[model samples]
Target chain A: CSSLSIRTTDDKSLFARTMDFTMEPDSKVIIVPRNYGIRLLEKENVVINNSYAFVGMGSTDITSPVLYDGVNEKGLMGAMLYYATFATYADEPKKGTTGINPVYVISQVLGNCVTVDDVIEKLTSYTLLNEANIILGFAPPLHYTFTDASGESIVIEPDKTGITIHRKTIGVMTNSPGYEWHQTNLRAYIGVTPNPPQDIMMGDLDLTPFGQGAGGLGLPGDFTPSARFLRVAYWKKYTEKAKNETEGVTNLFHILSSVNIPKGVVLTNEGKTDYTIYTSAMCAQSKNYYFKLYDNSRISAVSLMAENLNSQDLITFEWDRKQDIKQLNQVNVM
Target chain B: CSSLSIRTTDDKSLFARTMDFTMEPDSKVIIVPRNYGIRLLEKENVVINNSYAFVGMGSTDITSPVLYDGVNEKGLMGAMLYYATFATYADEPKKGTTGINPVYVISQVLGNCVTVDDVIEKLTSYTLLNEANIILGFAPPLHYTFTDASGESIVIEPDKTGITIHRKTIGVMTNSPGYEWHQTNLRAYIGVTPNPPQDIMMGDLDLTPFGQGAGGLGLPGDFTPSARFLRVAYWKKYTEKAKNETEGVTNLFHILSSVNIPKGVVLTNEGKTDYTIYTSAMCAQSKNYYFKLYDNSRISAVSLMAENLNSQDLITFEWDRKQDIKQLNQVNVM
Candidate 1:
C-alpha cells in the first residue's frame, strides 16, 4: 500500500491510499457503528466495543473484519500499509497488557481515537503481537499512519525494541524498509520541481530545457517504496493549494494517480499479480470516504454523516466494480 | 518548443505541440485560406500563392505572420522548435533556389505538403537562409517536425553542410543538438517502464518494489531537449492506444502535460521569464485543431471543415485568455 495526506487551503485534511496487493483483496466499503463488537483475535474471545463509528475498506474473511484504512465519526483517519522486512513485533503482550495483533492496529486506533494524540496515548497500553493472521497464515509486517481534522499526523513502526511513534511526520507513507530511510532518500530528488530547467552551456552550445517541467528531471518515476515516496512527496510539495474539500479531494486523487498500478505490470515469485485493486481518498473534516477501483476509474463516495451511527450490525456497501463512462450525444456538442 | 505525434488504435493521427518562450508572443488562432500570399524572404517582393489552407498559432506582428506550428487542410501538420546552437543555416540561398527564412518553414511546407514525403521533397527545393527574424532581431535557431494523417513523420535539422531531413523518425522532437544524438542518448534509460522492479535479496532480507511504476525509475524528468525527447519517446512507446480521435486527443494532452511549463520557473539571462504560452493539438483525420493556454486549462477547438477553405484573406480568432471554471452549487453536490 502507498499513502499520503494533504491539507486544503481551507484547512481540511485529506488522506489518500492505494491498496496494491499480490492477490485481489475482495474488499468492501463497511461502516461499523458505534458500540459494535470487534474481534481482535481468532481463538481468544477479546471483543472490544467500538467507541466511534467509522467507514473504510476491509475484508470480512479474516478472523475479524481487519480494516486496511478508515475515517471515524470524530474526523480522525488512519491506514495500515505493508512494511515488509523492517517491521518487527513482540513475541508476547507486555506483562500486564493484551496482545494486539499487527493487523488490528487500524481497527483499534480509528475505532476509538479522536485525535492523533489519542492514538499515540492509546497504543502505549498494548503490545503488538507477532501472531499469524488467519488469512495470510503469517504475521503481516506493517506500519501505520493516523491524522485528525486538526491536520496533525504520525507514523508508527514496529521495531525489535518496541513500537516507535514518529511525531511531526511529513504526512506521507509507503511500503518501505523504514520511514527515516525514505525521508533521507528524498534528498536524491531535492531539485525536482514543476519549473523548467535553466539553460546550461555544453562548451559553447547553449542547452535550454527542451520543454516545460525540466526541473523535475531527477525525480524517481519508479514504483519502489523509496521512489514512490519521493514522487508523492515532490508532487504534493509543488502542486497548487486547493480551496476546499471538493478541490482537495480532486487534487489528492491526481497525486495518487502518479503511483496507481495497472494489471500485468507487476508479478510476484509465486506467479501472482500485484496491482492496485482500489484507491481511497478520505477527508477528516467532513468524514467522507471516497474511492475508485482499478477496473473503474470513476470515483464513488460515502459520507459518514449520512449513515446511522446507532445501528447494531455492520452497514456494508457492495464495492462497485462495473466500469462507467458518461456518454455525450451529438446534442451535447456545439 | 516541443512536439510529438500519436496514432489512435483506429489509426487516426494526432500531433501535439507546446510553445515555450521567453516572452508572450501575443499569439492568435489563425486560418490561412487557400491562394493566400506568403513571403519567403525579408526585403524581397517574392510572394508565393498558398496552395492549401492551414490553421495554427502565430503572431500577425512579424514580417509576414511567421507561424510557430500549424496543420494544413491536407491533414499535413508541422512545427518549428528552437534549436539554438545546433541549428546551422546557409549564409545565402543555394544557387538557383529561393531563399527561405528559417521561420517561414511552417508556412511554406505545411501550406503545401500532403504527406511527410512531400515535406521532405518541398524542403529540398529551397535553401534555409540565415537572416534575422523581424521580431526577435536574430536569425532564430530552429528545427522542424512534420507528420501526416497516414502516421508518417520526419525531423528536419539544419547543418553547416546544408539541411538534413531525418526520415524514419520516432514521431517526437525537442530543441538543441542533433536528432541522431538524442536517439543514441535514449540508451541511457532503456530500462525505464510502467512495471515494478523484481525482488532483490540483500543478505537475508528480500527487497521488492515499494510500489508500482518501479520500472520507470530511471526516466529523465528534466525539461532539457534531450531529456524531453526521451520522456515523450518512452511515454508514447508504452502508452495504451486510443480507440478514436477524441480519446487520442485526450491521451496526447496528458502526455504533453508532463512537460508543461509554468511561469516564474524559467528565467532567461535577460531577466525575462520563459513559460508555455499555449499548447495545440491537431487531428489529421478530422482536421480539428484543439488548444489551451497556460492561464486556462479548459481545452477549446476549431475544425477546419467547419470553416470556408476558399476565403480570400487570413481568418483570425482571438485567443481566449479569460479563466473560467464550472461552479457546482449545493444542489449539484449530492
Candidate 2:
C-alpha cells in the first residue's frame, strides 16, 4: 500500500488532512452512529459501553469490524493499513483481560477514543490478539494512524517490541516492513531544496539550470513505499499553499493526484490486481469528510456536523454506485 | 576568496560569516573611524568625492586598501575572498561609473553601503576592474560578501559576464571557483539528512543508528566547496536551535569550527601551503565581530558600538601571530 496525508497548511479555520490510500481494501462506507455502546471485545469490534459515535467505511464483521478509515465525533481521525510480517501481538491476553485483535483497532480506536492522547493511553491497556478473517486473505496485517483536530498525527504499530508508536513528521504511511525502516529511509533525501541550481562557468561554457523542476532533481519516482513516501513528502512540502478549506481540499487532491496510482501498474500475489480503489480527505475540525472513487473522479462530501452523535441508533447510507454527475454545472459560465 | 555566512536563526538580528584565505592577503586589522570619507576607485586608489566611516581590517595598499573583513557604524559587514579562476571584470568602466578594484571592494562595500541590498545596488552602479595586486604574489582574484542588520546576505562575484550576485540560502561560503558551481554542485547531495536512520530489519538482526550524526552520514567531508557547502547546509537545518544573540554567536562559532582547516591538510598549487589562516564571525546587529588565528583557538572581538566612526585617522592593531593560546592545562591536568 502507498499513501500521503496532508495536515492543513492554512492557519485559517477548517484544518484538515487529505487522506489518500493506494490499495483495494474490500471497503464500503459504513456509518457507526452516536451512543453505539461498545465493549473491550476479545477481537475486532467498536464501542457499546456508551462509546462515542463515528461514521466511516467498515467491513461486514459486525461482531468486530475494521474501519477502512474514519473520523470520530471528537474530531479524532484514524485509518487501519497493513503492517505485514512486522506486526506482533501481545504474547497472550492478560490473565483477566479480554483479548483484542488488529481487525478491530479502527473502531477500537476511533469508536472509543476522543483524542490521539486517549488512543495512545489505551495501547498499553489492551491485549492485542490475531484472529481469522472472514473477508478474503488474512486477519489484516495492520497498523493504525490517528490524527486529531490539532493536526497532530501518530502511527501505532503493534510490534514484537510492544506498540512502537511514531510521530508522523513526514505525515504519510504505507504497507511497510516497518515504520523505523521508513524513517531511516528518509535520511537519503536531505538534499532536496526548492532553489533551482544557479548557472556555473565551465571554462568558456556556462552551465545553467537544465530545466524546471530540476530543483527536485533526484526525488525517487517509483511506486514502492520508499519511493511513494519520498515522492509525496516532497510535494507536501513544496506544493503551492492552500488559502482555506475549499482550496485546501483542491490543493490536497492535486497533491495526492501526483501519487494517484493507475490500475494494472500493480498486481496481487495470486495473479489478482492492486490499485487505489478510492481517495478521501477529512477535516476533523469541521467534521466533514470527502471522497472520490476510482470510477468517478467527482468528489462527494459527508458532514458529521449535523448528525445526532449522542443517539444509540446506527445510520447507514446506500453506496451511490452510479457514475454520478461528472461535471456538475456548478459554474454558471458567465 | 572563500567564505560562508549565517543569518540569525530567529528573526532580524545577528549575521556572521567565516573568512578564510588560500593566499597571503598581507592582512592587518585597521580601524578607520566614522564620518571618514571614502572614494570608489580603480585598483589601488580611492573615490575622493565621498566616503563614510566604518572600522575593521585592511592591508598595506593604503590608498585603496583591501580589508580582509570589516564592519560599519550602520551595522553593515563585508568581507573579501578569492574567486580564483572565475572572476572577470567589466571590459571598459561603465561610461559614467566609478572604477572600483578588488582591493577596494570590502571597504567600498562596507564603507558606504548599509545593507546587502545597498551593496547589490552599488554593484550595478560601480564598474569593477581587474588591476594587478601590489600586496600579493599576483593579481587579486576576488569576490565579496555583504551582510547587514536585517540578517540579509549576498555574495558578489565578478566574472567575464559581469558582476553576479547570489542570495545566501545555505548560509555559507567557501573559497570557490565560482559561487554558481558551489551552488549547483549541492544538488548531488540531496539525500543527506540530520535525522539518523532509524532501526531496520535485515533478516533477523535489527540495525539501528550506531551513533549520533548517523543521519548526516553522507555529508561531504572534503575541503572542496561542494562538500563544505552540503556539510554545513545539512548542519544548518539539523543543528540544535539557538534562542538569542549570545547563543547564536556560540552556535555560529561551532558551525565554523567544523570546517576550520588545519595546516598540512590542504596543499596549494606550486606545492605551497594551504590552511584556514583565520576563522571569524561578525554580527551586524550586535555590531561585534569575533575571530581566531590559525594557531590560536581563543576568540578576540572588536565592537563597532565602541568605536569613533567620525574620525579621519585610521587605527591599527598589532597581529598576535605568536600562536600563544594553547591548552596548557589539558596536558598536565591528568
Candidate 3:
C-alpha cells in the first residue's frame, strides 16, 4: 500500500498538510499544502517526454507520470498516493471520461485547480476511471488529500465500487486499515483527557504508571501506516487546537513527527529497507507549497502557475518515474 | 546539553558520511561528508545588520551570528557545532589579535575554502582577536568536521590548553559527552553482534513473550543522546556493510530514525516546545544539504553556494555566524 497521511488545523485557517509515501520499487515523498489548486486536462495533442503533464489514456489504460495532487501559483496544495485495496476510481463514464492516466489527472487537477470547490466542480464534470494498468502487476487503487486557502480539507478515497469523500472536520488523515476504524478508535477516548491510569501487577503487587492519558490507552505503538494514522490523528487533533498561526505551525510539526515513517522499518514485501517520508506545508492564504525530501534531506521548492501550466520547461524527471514509465510504454507499444 | 548523535557506514569507501544534531533555543541538523574543510574566523569585524566578510573577532568573546557549517564553491564541506568545554582565545594581544566569532569562521571557511590544507594555511596566518569580542557569557565550545573531494576527513576540537585533531576513521559525529567517551562506549560491543537469536519462553515463567532478542541484549534501549549515538553507530555500520550507495542513503535515514526524538518528549527550560526529531543529510559529491523540519513530514533541501544563499530567501535558516553577528551588532549599537 502507498503510505499517505494528512493533517489540518482547527482554526479553519485553510492550512492543510499531506505526506505522500509512494512505496513502489522506488519510493518517494510528495506533499501538497493549502492555497494550491489543480486542473483537469483534455488535450488531444500529447507530447512525449517533453512537458510535465498528466496523460489520460483511458480507464485501465491511463499513463500520467506528472502525478499532480494539487498545485497553486499562490501555494495551495494537493497530493495523491497508492492506497491498495481500500480505494478505487468512480466508473461513471457519463460523468465525462478523459483518456488520461490517473497520475496525470491528479497532477493536472492540482496544477490548475485552486480551491476545494474548484476541484469538486471539476470532478463532478470529469469521469475518473481505474483504467491505468498497474505497474509491476499491482492493482491501481489510490486515495488523495486536498486543501485550499480557506483551510478547508477533504480526503478522497476510492473504494472497490465507488468514491468515498470524507470532509475533514479536524484535518488529519492516517494510513489504513481504514479511515473509519481510526475514527472509532478516537471515540474510545474523551477529548482533553490527561494520561490514563495503567495498572501493573508483579506477582502480588500492583503499581500504576504516571503520564498515562486516556488517549494513550489502546494506542497502537507500531509504525505501520494504519498505526501511524491513528497516532498522527490524535496528535493533530490535540496540537491543532492552537491560538495563532505560529503555534499552529509549531504544533503541526510536532503532530507530524509522532507518525513520521523513519527508514529501516520492514514493509509487507520489502525487507529491511529505508522508507521515504515526504511532507508539504501549504499556506492557505499565500498559496505556497513548502516541501522536503527525507532521504535527500534538502527542501526543494516550486510553485504552480498558469504561465508554466502548458510549458515543456515545467517538466522535471524523477529517477524511478522515468524508469517505470519507459518500461510500461515499451510493453504497451510492443 | 545539546542533543547530539552519529552514524557510520563501515564500507571502506572514500566517502565519510555523518549526521550531527544540535539543540539550542531552536534546533539545527548538520550533515558532513568527507574532505570538506572549515576555518574559525574573527567574529568582530562582521557587519551585523548587513553582510560583511571575515573581520577580526576572537572565538572566546565574539558574539556575532555567522555560518556554522556549509560547503564552498570548490565543494569543501564543513560543519561546526558546540562540542566540549574547551573553546577559548588567546589572552595576550599579538599580531593585532582580531576578534572573529567562531560561528562565522566555519561559514567563511566553507564558503571560500575547498581543501583541508587550504583551511589550515588560512588559519595559520590569521589572528582572530581584534575584530570582535570573545563569545560572551558561557561559551558554547565547538568541534568541527571538515571533508573534501577526495574522501579525506578531519575532526577539530579544543582541549584545555591546545587543539586536538583526529583523522576521521569512522566518519560520523554526534552531540557530546566527548569523542573519547564515544570511543569508550563502542568498546563495550566488541564481541556483541547483530542478527542475534531470539529467545522463547513458555506460559507462566515465560518472560520472553516479546520474542527473540527481547531479553538477550547488550545494547541500551533508552533514547538518551549517548544511547542514540551507539544505537545509530551500530545500525549504520551494519547497514553500510549490507548495501550500496542507493541503499546506503536509505540505510542512513533508517539509522537516524532508530534514534529520532519525538515531540512531546523534547522539553525546553522555559516550557516551550521543540521538535522530536531534526535530521540533515549532505551529499559530498553533489554539494546538497537535505533536511527535515520537525513539524513537516517532508524533507526540504538547499544547496551550499553563493548563488543559492540569500538573506531574503524564505527557506530554513540556521542560527549561525551571520544571524548572531546581526543580532550582536544590533545590541552593540543599542
Q: Pick by DockQ: which candidate is best?
A: 1
lDDT value, residue A296 of candidate 2: 71
Instruction: Determine the C-alpha RMSD for candidate 2 after optimal superposition of all C-alphas.
Output: 15.3
Pitting candidate 1 against candidate 3, the one with the higher TM-score is 1
Residues A128-230 of candidate 3 have per-residue lDDT tens digits of 6545444434334556667666666766666665556677544555455455665676676443222233466999986542211222444443444555555
Give me the displacement of residue A303 in model 2, in angstroms.
67
Assess candidate 1 and give its lDDT: 0.75
True contacts kept of each: 0.23, 0.00, 0.03
DockQ order of candidates, best first?
1, 3, 2
Off by over 4 Å in 2: A1-334, B7-12, B22-25, B42-46, B49-51, B177-181, B323-334
TM-score of 3: 0.49
Of candidate 1 chain B, the 10-residue stretch with the lowest lDDT total is: B325-334
Candidate 3 chain A TM is 0.66
Instruction: Please identify model 3 stretches exceeding 4 Å from their true place.
Output: A1-65, A73-76, A89-105, A111-114, A117-128, A134-139, A188-221, A237-258, A270-274, A306-334, B1-254, B257-318, B321-334
- The TM-score leader among the candidates is 1
TM-score for each model: 0.73, 0.48, 0.49
DockQ of 2: 0.02
Question: Across residues A1-334, which tens digit of lDDT does each residue of candidate 2 receive?
Answer: 4455455556422322223344444556666765565545534454446366776766654454456777777888878777778788764676766677667777778777887788888766677776655554456567777777776677888887777887644556776667777766654554344665454432223445546555555566666666766666657667776666667777767767766667777665765556666777766777677777777777778777567776556565545556665447585433
